[PDB]
Design an enzyme around this catalytic site. Structure first.
Site, PDB file in Angstrom:
ATOM      1  N   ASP A 153       0.793  -1.226   0.000  1.00 21.59           N
ATOM      2  CA  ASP A 153       0.000   0.000   0.000  1.00 21.59           C
ATOM      3  C   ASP A 153       0.825   1.276   0.000  1.00 21.59           C
ATOM      4  O   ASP A 153       1.310   1.711   1.028  1.00 21.59           O
ATOM      5  CB  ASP A 153      -0.849  -0.039   1.257  1.00 21.59           C
ATOM      6  CG  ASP A 153      -1.914   1.033   1.260  1.00 21.59           C
ATOM      7  OD1 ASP A 153      -1.894   1.935   0.376  1.00 21.59           O
ATOM      8  OD2 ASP A 153      -2.790   1.002   2.146  1.00 21.59           O
ATOM      9  N   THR A 154       0.933   1.910  -1.166  1.00 19.36           N
ATOM     10  CA  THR A 154       1.704   3.126  -1.288  1.00 19.36           C
ATOM     11  C   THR A 154       1.041   4.314  -0.583  1.00 19.36           C
ATOM     12  O   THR A 154       1.727   5.314  -0.320  1.00 19.36           O
ATOM     13  CB  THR A 154       1.923   3.499  -2.781  1.00 19.36           C
ATOM     14  OG1 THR A 154       0.669   3.679  -3.435  1.00 19.36           O
ATOM     15  CG2 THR A 154       2.691   2.398  -3.488  1.00 19.36           C
ATOM     16  N   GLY A 155      -0.228   4.217  -0.242  1.00 11.27           N
ATOM     17  CA  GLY A 155      -0.937   5.255   0.451  1.00 11.27           C
ATOM     18  C   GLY A 155      -0.817   5.192   1.950  1.00 11.27           C
ATOM     19  O   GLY A 155      -1.395   6.017   2.662  1.00 11.27           O
TER      20      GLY A 155
HETATM   21  C1  LIG Z   1      -6.658   6.806   3.450  1.00 13.51           C
HETATM   22  C2  LIG Z   1      -5.154   6.636   3.115  1.00 13.51           C
HETATM   23  C3  LIG Z   1      -4.505   8.053   3.166  1.00 13.51           C
HETATM   24  C4  LIG Z   1      -4.525   5.937   4.361  1.00 13.51           C
HETATM   25  N1  LIG Z   1      -4.704   4.509   4.399  1.00 13.51           N
HETATM   26  C5  LIG Z   1      -4.185   3.505   3.458  1.00 13.51           C
HETATM   27  C6  LIG Z   1      -5.186   3.293   2.287  1.00 13.51           C
HETATM   28  O1  LIG Z   1      -4.512   2.637   1.190  1.00 13.51           O
HETATM   29  C7  LIG Z   1      -6.379   2.405   2.728  1.00 13.51           C
HETATM   30  C8  LIG Z   1      -6.062   0.912   3.031  1.00 13.51           C
HETATM   31  C9  LIG Z   1      -7.294   0.132   3.388  1.00 13.51           C
HETATM   32  C10 LIG Z   1      -7.790  -0.835   2.538  1.00 13.51           C
HETATM   33  C11 LIG Z   1      -8.941  -1.579   2.846  1.00 13.51           C
HETATM   34  C12 LIG Z   1      -9.605  -1.330   4.052  1.00 13.51           C
HETATM   35  C13 LIG Z   1      -9.125  -0.360   4.924  1.00 13.51           C
HETATM   36  C14 LIG Z   1      -7.970   0.361   4.578  1.00 13.51           C
HETATM   37  N2  LIG Z   1      -7.407   2.408   1.686  1.00 13.51           N
HETATM   38  C15 LIG Z   1      -8.576   3.045   1.712  1.00 13.51           C
HETATM   39  O2  LIG Z   1      -8.978   3.744   2.623  1.00 13.51           O
HETATM   40  O3  LIG Z   1      -9.277   2.806   0.557  1.00 13.51           O
HETATM   41  C16 LIG Z   1     -10.680   3.137   0.490  1.00 13.51           C
HETATM   42  C17 LIG Z   1     -10.881   3.753  -0.916  1.00 13.51           C
HETATM   43  O4  LIG Z   1     -10.992   2.667  -1.794  1.00 13.51           O
HETATM   44  C18 LIG Z   1     -11.591   1.541  -1.158  1.00 13.51           C
HETATM   45  O5  LIG Z   1     -10.806   0.370  -1.358  1.00 13.51           O
HETATM   46  C19 LIG Z   1     -10.162  -0.050  -0.156  1.00 13.51           C
HETATM   47  C20 LIG Z   1     -11.000   0.595   0.971  1.00 13.51           C
HETATM   48  C21 LIG Z   1     -11.582   1.893   0.353  1.00 13.51           C
HETATM   49  S1  LIG Z   1      -5.060   3.892   5.923  1.00 13.51           S
HETATM   50  O6  LIG Z   1      -5.347   2.450   5.784  1.00 13.51           O
HETATM   51  O7  LIG Z   1      -6.047   4.692   6.552  1.00 13.51           O
HETATM   52  C22 LIG Z   1      -3.542   3.987   6.882  1.00 13.51           C
HETATM   53  C23 LIG Z   1      -2.623   2.952   6.714  1.00 13.51           C
HETATM   54  C24 LIG Z   1      -1.362   3.143   7.255  1.00 13.51           C
HETATM   55  C25 LIG Z   1      -1.096   4.289   7.899  1.00 13.51           C
HETATM   56  C26 LIG Z   1      -2.050   5.324   8.056  1.00 13.51           C
HETATM   57  C27 LIG Z   1      -3.282   5.174   7.546  1.00 13.51           C
HETATM   58  O8  LIG Z   1      -1.509   6.347   8.741  1.00 13.51           O
HETATM   59  C28 LIG Z   1      -0.153   5.985   9.001  1.00 13.51           C
HETATM   60  O9  LIG Z   1       0.062   4.660   8.488  1.00 13.51           O
END
Ligand SMILES: CC(C)CN(C[C@@H](O)[C@H](Cc1ccccc1)NC(=O)O[C@H]1CO[C@H]2OCC[C@H]21)S(=O)(=O)c1ccc2c(c1)OCO2
Ligand SMILES: [Cl-]
Ligand SMILES: [Cl-]
Ligand SMILES: [Cl-]
Ligand SMILES: [Cl-]
Ligand SMILES: [Cl-]
Ligand SMILES: [Cl-]
Ligand SMILES: [Cl-]
Ligand SMILES: [Cl-]
Ligand SMILES: [Cl-]
Ligand code: NA
Ligand SMILES: [Zn+2]
Ligand SMILES: [Zn+2]
Ligand SMILES: [Zn+2]
Ligand SMILES: [Zn+2]
Ligand SMILES: [Zn+2]
Ligand SMILES: [Zn+2]
Ligand SMILES: [Zn+2]
Ligand SMILES: [Zn+2]
Ligand SMILES: [Zn+2]
Ligand SMILES: [Zn+2]
Ligand SMILES: [Zn+2]
Lengths: 99, 99
Positions: free
Chosen positions: B25-27
């Protein structure tokens, strides 16, 4: 372009002409942007993240300019703390994760 | 390896020998995993994302085997709905995001 991930892979983009800071997010299925106003032609969508769920407004066929490219893609607007371009847009751009 | 992002980039990792499925996860700045206990020597901290915030426990120098490499990295445990390998691990593995 190449992002080596020592810093966040953040870029600027335009969504229907509106400038945004966006995070290129391989962990997101969808693209979620806060604060932009794309109008009344939407459907509600429920999106789940690390902390729970939010309602979003889903807009299809939105013009996006990023990384010197122009694509049309689905954008959801809602309360995300960081604007994210997820895999729907990363694939439209032709992006890959590599090792 | 190349992840084309048409699908979620999910792989099997071993954390201190325990297999877990993880999202590359690059995000994500940090790496967060559920269902595993890493013990009493942590630092508590709060992370935010879509939906809100969670409490985590941050562990340093955790043994991680993934993508046929072994690294030592920081891992948070907490009630995350999906296990996430963020940039701290992606950079230790030599991963990049490309257009
Ligand atoms: C919102 C972004 C800025 C941050 N996130 C990582 C994301 O990649 C997250 C990772 C994620 C993936 C699945 C479930 C929960 C989180 N994906 C997500 O929110 O995606 C949503 C949008 O598209 C849909 O597909 C996936 C869920 C929806 S996170 O999971 O909240 C997170 C992960 C590591 C972190 C952090 C926050 O702060 C510091 O380290
Ligand atoms: Cl750099
Ligand atoms: Cl970098
Ligand atoms: Cl950097
Ligand atoms: Cl424009
Ligand atoms: Cl929905
Ligand atoms: Cl979702
Ligand atoms: Cl943090
Ligand atoms: Cl070993
Ligand atoms: Cl390239
Ligand atoms: Na201690
Ligand atoms: Zn850098
Ligand atoms: Zn334009
Ligand atoms: Zn910024
Ligand atoms: Zn989705
Ligand atoms: Zn979704
Ligand atoms: Zn849709
Ligand atoms: Zn952090
Ligand atoms: Zn070992
Ligand atoms: Zn092994
Ligand atoms: Zn729970
Ligand atoms: Zn290229």
């Amino acid at each position: 372009p190449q992002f080596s991930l020592w810093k966040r892979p953040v870029v600027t983009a335009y969504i229907e002409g509106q400038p945004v800071e966006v995070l290129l997010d391989t962990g997101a299925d969808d693209s979620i942007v806060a604060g932009i106003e794309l109008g009344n032609n939407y459907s509600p969508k429920i999106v789940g993240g690390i902390g729970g769920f939010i309602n979003t407004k889903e807009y299809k066929n939105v013009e996006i300019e990023v990384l010197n490219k122009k694509v049309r893609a689905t954008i959801m607007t809602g309360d995300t703390p960081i604007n994210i371009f997820g895999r729907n847009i990363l694939t439209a751009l032709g992006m890959s994760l590599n090792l």
